């Protein structure tokens, strides 16, 4: 019983990959421009100097 009480939450925070979920949320937002950045082969603008 003590092992279950101290192991359910242990396996919960132990089996967690929320970083990929955050990346997936950002993908849901603008994936066609962020993940699929295959439109231009090189940029064309100025820099800072």
């Amino acid at each position: 019983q003590k092992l279950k009480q101290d192991g359910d939450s242990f396996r919960m925070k132990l089996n967690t990959q929320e970083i990929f979920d955050d990346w997936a949320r950002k993908v849901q937002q603008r994936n066609l421009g962020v993940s699929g950045r295959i439109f231009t082969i090189e940029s064309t603008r100025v820099r800072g100097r």
Binding site: E42, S43, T44, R45, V46, R47
Partner: peptide, 13 residues
């Protein structure tokens, strides 16, 4: 440099 940026972003504003 500046000339390269102008030759590249001329059509890309």
């Amino acid at each position: 440099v500046f000339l390269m940026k102008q030759q590249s972003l001329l059509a890309k504003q």
